[PDB]
């Protein structure tokens, strides 16, 4: 992400012709944020504005999709198995011990995701959301102007 942020911002300032802005703004991180993550995202989030919608609708939707999958990765990453097993046990008691649904019974017993599996799925959602949101932002920001 750091190397692609550097590449995209330097090349974007080269294409726009204002290399002095990158030269005087890449020194401090607030300028990095303001002139990369905020300035170039103006065309990204206007994909399906309520007043008007244009061809960048897939890119804003994919940006928010990457945010959501990143957050689901956080859901798998912070919480660990052992609180989820008790909740799944309560859901087991809910399904097994209710009218009109105790007739339908699982064949594989619902168990919580194992710790290695938990780390793997958290990393998977993390990386999928990361890649999708960065691809969406990069393509939208570069293609909105040129």
């Amino acid at each position: 992400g750091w190397v692609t942020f550097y590449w995209h911002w330097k090349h974007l300032t080269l294409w726009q012709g204002n290399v002095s802005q990158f030269d005087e703004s890449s020194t401090y991180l607030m300028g990095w944020l303001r002139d990369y993550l905020w300035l170039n995202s103006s065309q990204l989030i206007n994909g399906y504005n309520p007043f008007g919608m244009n061809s960048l609708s897939v890119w804003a939707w994919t940006f928010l999709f990457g945010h959501l999958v990143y957050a689901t990765g956080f859901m798998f990453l912070i919480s660990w198995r052992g609180y989820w097993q008790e909740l799944i046990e309560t859901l087991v008691w809910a399904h097994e011990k209710t009218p009109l649904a105790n007739l339908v019974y699982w064949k594989d017993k619902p168990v919580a995701l194992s710790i290695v599996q938990a780390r793997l799925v958290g990393l998977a959602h993390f990386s999928v959301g990361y890649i999708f949101t960065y691809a969406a932002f990069l393509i939208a920001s570069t293609a909105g102007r040129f």
């Binding site: 991180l29 607030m30 944020l33 303001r34 905020w38 995202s41 103006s42 989030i45 206007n46 994909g47 399906y48 504005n49 309520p50 919608m53 609708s57 897939v58 804003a60 939707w61 928010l64 990453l77 912070i78 919480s79 660990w80 198995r81 052992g82 609180y83 097993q85 008790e86 909740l87 046990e89 309560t90 859901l91 008691w93 809910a94 168990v111 919580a112 194992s114 710790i115 958290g122």
Partner: protein
């Protein structure tokens, strides 16, 4: 029966236990062999349950702990009063509150900080404050800095007195356990005495001091020639012209002619148009009625003179057939467990702080507070977060009581035992309503986002498209607007301008205007209900399953705060109730962040703004009814439409807010190490570093160890919460200062 049982000199006053830092715990009394000894020292520092098993010493310890906290808060309040006395523009702000921004913190010119001394007006430079102390010092009639100096010195004196009181009441004269167990005397003395006496004293101060000062302040009289409140107190002639009922002179009070006091004990709905806050006469009658209600309620329980109520009898007498034994033993639990009372008090304190934030954003009780958007936003957000923290701590200490102080002997078929019995049903139904609320709030949001993205705005859940009109809230608004007409005929107007029909404005800016509720407000309110239901599910599940569970039957014997029971049963990580609170802290953070985002966006888009001759123009373009239905609309029109002043704050008075914003980003991002990772990798890295320090003989005598799993989770949640809170604080304050 109720008496004062006090043991004199139980603990010698000496630095002998100060010499050895590890003395409260016998496990820590040996020595610091590992680096986890320090974290256990600072962790078990105030955990008085494992220090000793005697309840009397624990009660003395917590009594002097509360004394020390009271002294600390009094020191802080005295420091705030001293700052307002010395480094402030309160004299300038009194003569011009609508044009001079409040400022009470002055920085040093040491290293580039002179840019932080912003031009707040009145020939003064400093940090533009947001606590609203100037509004409070205008409500409670305060004119000069001499009075603030006197208040600060008195607060310092009372803080020293409180610290001396803690030292005395622990080391010199410590009360016995029967003194602390006098619950009826405690309740009577903190209902009639504390609350009632404070309410009556504040009502008297408002009537004799604050009412004439505020009557002369909004009339255009400069505060320099305003008479001091002792002149109003001693002399009836000066107070008679401002309020003609003082010419009677306490005659209507004893002769039951209280209708003659209708000039300064008024019953008016709305706000003062000159200042924008509530009428001080209304607050005077309010605090007087509150003092009455607490004086009558403080004589309910029976302590020593036969008459009254016995709480054990009240609890044991309320027994209903679907509950078996009804409140049978709760008096025995609440008189013997500090953590149960801590949970109850913290939950009610947090909820009441939430009510405090909501009812200050609704009715501003201070002059020139509604127009000061920064003070209102800061007060709402701050008390919002403090209430959330107190509620989460209530859940934590309830779980601690469940683990430690709960015993099955006294409770067999009472309410607590039956709540333990059907805990799976409660958790399953809460999970069902959790999933239901989550789907038909957030899936509605995602569906609106999709229909916006698919070019079909007529299929969205908006006001223009098919709508979910909040009919109940709007009906309550209409009822409260028409409440003074029929159900409260003695009220001048509506109790708040949330549901009114008029717009008040001070200094050309909107103070408080009617609030319209649409589909977006419905979506956000049900999002809030979903989020609060999830957080209460996590906390209640942690409390209920702290003792035993179908996974780990012996969780009671494993303590409250333990990392895991090993990788058995597929892995029982985070199974303790402490980890349930650890997750509930993040869920609290999400809940209150979305709540204050809704507050800021709704108030900036539909309440706050500058009034013009041609209609009322708000801070934003009134886009809450059009952009709060989608996630991308929320993002672009709240987090991106705003925060343009935070990024461009550099070189200005509010650049420190941008620095704080990025440091908060740093700390929020730094926490995810302690959240994602574990301990074995860090322990092995520490082993390699230990080898490096061993190679050239700088090996510490204390063995370096990685942080514990519970310690790592605590560090992660603390850094995460601190970063998120400071992020929202910096963004909110910079946006509301550079615009409002």
């Amino acid at each position: 029966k109720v008496k004062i049982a006090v043991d004199r000199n139980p603990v010698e006053t000496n630095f002998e236990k100060w010499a050895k830092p590890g003395h409260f715990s016998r496990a820590l009394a040996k020595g610091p062999n590992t680096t986890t000894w320090i974290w256990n020292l600072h962790a078990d520092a105030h955990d008085f349950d494992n220090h000793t098993s005697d309840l009397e010493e624990i009660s003395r310890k917590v009594f002097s702990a509360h004394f020390g906290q009271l002294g600390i808060i009094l020191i802080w309040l005295s420091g705030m009063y001293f700052h307002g006395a010395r480094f402030s523009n309160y004299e300038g702000w009194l003569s011009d509150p609508t044009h001079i921004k409040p400022s009470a913190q002055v920085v040093w010119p040491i290293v580039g900080q002179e840019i932080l001394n912003g031009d707040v007006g009145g020939g003064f430079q400093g940090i533009q404050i947001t606590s609203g102390f100037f509004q409070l010092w205008r409500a409670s009639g305060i004119t000069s800095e001499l009075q603030l100096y006197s208040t600060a010195i008195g607060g310092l004196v009372l803080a020293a007195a409180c610290f001396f009181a803690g030292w005395f009441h622990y080391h010199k004269a410590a009360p016995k356990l029967e003194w602390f167990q006098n619950v009826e005397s405690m309740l009577n003395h903190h209902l009639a005495g504390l609350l009632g006496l404070g309410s009556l004293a504040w009502a008297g101060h408002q009537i004799h001091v604050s009412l004439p000062v505020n009557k002369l302040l909004d009339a255009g009289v400069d505060p320099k020639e305003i008479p001091l409140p002792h002149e109003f107190l001693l002399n009836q002639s000066i107070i008679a012209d401002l309020y003609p009922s003082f010419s009677k002179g306490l005659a209507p009070f004893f002769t039951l002619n209280w209708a003659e006091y209708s000039d300064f004990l008024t019953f008016k709905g709305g706000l003062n148009p000159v200042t924008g806050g509530l009428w001080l006469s209304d607050t005077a009658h309010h605090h007087l009625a509150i003092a009455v209600l607490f004086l009558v309620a403080g004589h309910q329980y029976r302590t020593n003179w036969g008459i009254g109520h016995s709480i054990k009898d009240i609890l044991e007498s309320h027994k209903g057939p679907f509950t078996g034994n009804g409140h049978a033993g709760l008096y025995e639990i609440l008189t013997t467990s500090w953590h149960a009372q801590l949970a109850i008090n913290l939950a009610l304190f947090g909820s009441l702080s939430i009510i405090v934030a909501h009812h200050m954003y609704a009715m501003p009780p201070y002059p020139y507070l509604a127009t000061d958007y920064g003070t209102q936003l800061s007060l709402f957000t701050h008390h919002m977060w403090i209430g959330g923290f107190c509620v989460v701590g209530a859940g934590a200490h309830a779980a601690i009581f469940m683990v430690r102080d709960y015993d099955p002997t006294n409770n067999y078929n009472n309410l607590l035992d039956r709540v333990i019995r059907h805990r799976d049903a409660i958790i399953s139904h809460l999970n069902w309503v959790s999933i239901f609320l989550g789907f038909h709030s957030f899936g509605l949001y995602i569906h609106n986002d999709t229909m916006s993205a698919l070019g079909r705005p007529q299929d969205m859940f908006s006001d223009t498209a098919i709508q979910l009109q909040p009919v109940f809230a709007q009906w309550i608004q209409n009822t409260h607007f028409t409440a003074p007409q029929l159900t409260a005929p003695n009220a001048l107007a509506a109790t708040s301008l949330t549901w009114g029909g008029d717009v008040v404005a001070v200094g050309g800016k909107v103070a408080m205007m009617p609030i319209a509720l649409g589909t977006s407000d419905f979506l956000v309110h049900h999002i809030h209900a979903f989020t609060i239901h999830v957080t209460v599910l996590i906390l209640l599940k942690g409390v209920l399953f702290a003792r035993s569970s179908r996974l780990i039957p012996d969780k009671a014997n494993l303590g409250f705060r333990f990392p895991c029971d090993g990788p058995g049963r597929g892995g029982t990580c985070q199974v303790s109730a402490w980890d349930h609170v650890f997750l509930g802290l993040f869920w609290m953070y999400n809940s209150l962040s979305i709540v204050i985002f809704h507050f800021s966006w709704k108030m900036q888009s539909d309440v706050w703004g500058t009034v013009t001759d041609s209609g009322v123009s708000h801070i934003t373009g009134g886009n809450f009814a059009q952009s709060a239905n989608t996630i991308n609309g929320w993002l672009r029109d709240f987090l991106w439409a705003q925060s343009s002043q935070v990024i461009q704050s550099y070189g200005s008075a509010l650049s420190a807010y941008g620095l704080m914003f990025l440091g908060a980003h740093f700390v929020w991002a730094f926490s995810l190490m302690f959240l994602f990772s574990g301990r074995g990798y860090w322990q092995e890295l520490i082993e390699s570093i230990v080898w490096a320090h061993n190679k050239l003989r700088v090996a510490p005598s204390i063995q370096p160890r990685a942080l514990s799993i519970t310690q790592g989770r605590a560090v992660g949640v603390a850094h995460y919460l601190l970063g998120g809170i400071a992020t929202t604080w910096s963004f909110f304050l910079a946006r509301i200062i550079a615009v409002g």
